[PDB]
């Protein structure tokens, strides 16, 4: 069951230009939660491995 490390991303953006490109603004708020990252876990002893 080896597979890729999942990452759930939510991004909210905003672009805002005024006065003939006199002032440009780009704001992004992001929340990225990663799951199933491959790492060492202490398995139950019934799996055959510690």
């Amino acid at each position: 069951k080896l597979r890729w490390e999942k990452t759930q991303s939510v991004n909210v953006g905003l672009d805002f230009s005024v006065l003939n490109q006199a002032l440009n603004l780009s704001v992004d708020y992001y929340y990225r939660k990663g799951t199933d990252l491959i790492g060492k876990q202490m398995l139950p002893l019934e799996t055959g491995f510690v």
């Binding site: 069951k1 202490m42 398995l43 139950p44 002893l45 019934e46 799996t47 055959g48 491995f49 510690v50």
Partner: protein, 423 residues
């Protein structure tokens, strides 16, 4: 431009061929835990030495001290059991993928894996599960069955009926798959058809299914019934792997450390009546206290899982339990003649031939306790047969195991619960 997704990494041994899977299964065979010796330490046939280091490890097991052992005491090996179970399940799931092997070799490998899994489940449910014959023990959760190689799931305890159904199914699978008649003497730890039938007989004996137990025992005896005659060689140990009686020599039941740390209590020796060559063959020189040491284990060449004498005892017990008294008597006196001095064999025959059902069954149980001494069989026989009240005197104290004590079931090891809190 090139992609198939079929690439095997180079730099480590990845079992793919039949020889590689045979090596993996051989490593699984080697790591089979000998926890039946510790289980029979809980019985009445063993006494730990008066030492301190030798008693701080095995003292609490003998005293039935389930609550608050000494933290330095010996622990039953849950991890080894389930590691060998993982290897067996890996071999089973790797069928139809084993390369460079005759079908009669791949089938034998898969059947050996099936029988090893069945035997490991049987030993685990015997160690940490209530006896099959006990009332109200059929629906009680005993051990988690390992039937896959999944590393991301937590297994819950299966009931005794489920475990025994799985054991019977695996025995049938091994019977359908195992095709080897006899292995080499040096490679006799592996399973063969006689091993399948002997394991089925023992399983059915422990379940109380006397018909199937008798059927399997008689099948083994028809295929092989040659014993070691004690009267022509007094120092001929029936459990030796090179003897003509051993069917499978998988597990050395008695480890070196445990065998070096116990005696045979004077009561068990007193159970051996005059004329038994087993008295002078199994045990060493008498000690001043009256309790002898043992010479049936402690080293690798005394490995024995099944042998023909156990099959005779199973057949006799099944025949006695199904009112087939002539058959039980015939098998019991055959074993006694193979074991007893022919002067005492006359008295044994005279006594046995007039026994009723209950006395006959008790006699076969006594002969089973005598024959399988220091073979990891007394504790499980006590659990399956009567659960008798036991009195143990140790260092001036008395320890009492009630009839049908809940302590007849060894608690699941502490490390197993620590890793898996749901046990």
């Amino acid at each position: 431009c090139d992609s198939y997704l079929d690439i095997r990494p180079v730099g480590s041994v990845i079992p793919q061929t039949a020889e590689e899977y045979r090596a993996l299964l051989a490593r699984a065979y080697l790591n089979v835990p000998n926890d039946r010796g510790l289980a029979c330490l809980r019985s009445d046939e063993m006494l730990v030495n008066d030492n301190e280091y030798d008693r701080n490890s095995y003292g609490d097991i003998e005293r039935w001290n389930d609550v608050s052992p000494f933290p330095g005491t010996s622990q039953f090996t849950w991890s080894n059991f389930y590691n060998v179970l993982f290897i067996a399940n890996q071999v089973i799931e790797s069928q139809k993928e084993i390369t460079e092997g005759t079908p009669e070799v791949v089938n034998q490998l898969v059947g050996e894996a099936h029988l090893l899994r069945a035997y490991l489940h049987f030993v685990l449910v015997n160690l940490h599960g209530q006896p099959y014959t006990k009332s109200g023990a059929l629906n009680s959760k005993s051990i988690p069955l390992k039937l896959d190689t999944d590393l991301e799931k937590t297994l819950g305890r299966n009931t005794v009926e489920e475990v025994y159904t799985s054991i019977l199914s695996d025995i049938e699978h091994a019977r359908e798959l195992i095709n080897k008649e006899k292995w080499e003497t040096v490679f006799s730890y592996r399973f063969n058809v006689l091993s399948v039938d002997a394991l089925q007989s023992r399983v059915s004996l422990y379940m109380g299914a006397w018909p199937k137990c008798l059927e399997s025992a008689e099948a083994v005896l028809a295929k092989k019934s040659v014993l070691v005659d004690m009267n022509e060689t007094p120092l001929a140990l029936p459990n030796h792997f090179e003897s003509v009686e051993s069917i499978t020599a998988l597990e050395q039941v008695m480890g070196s450390s445990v065998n070096n740390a116990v005696w045979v209590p004077a009561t068990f020796l007193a159970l051996y009546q005059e004329g038994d060559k087993r008295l002078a063959a199994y045990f060493a020189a008498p000690d001043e206290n009256g309790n002898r040491k043992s010479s049936k284990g402690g080293k690798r060449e005394f490995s024995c899982t099944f042998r023909v004498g156990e099959l005779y005892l199973n057949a006799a017990e099944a025949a006695a339990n199904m009112d087939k008294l002539p058959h039980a008597r015939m098998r019991l006196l055959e074993l006694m003649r193979k074991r007893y001095t022919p002067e005492a064999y006359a008295k044994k025959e005279n006594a046995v031939n007039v026994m009723d059902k209950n006395a006959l069954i008790s006699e076969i149980l006594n002969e089973r306790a005598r024959e399988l001494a220091f073979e990891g069989h007394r504790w499980f026989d006590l659990r399956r047969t009567t659960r008798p009240r036991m009195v143990k005197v140790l260092q001036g104290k008395t320890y009492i195991l009630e009839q049908d004590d809940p302590r007849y079931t060894i608690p699941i090891p502490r490390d197993a619960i620590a890793a898996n809190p749901g046990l």
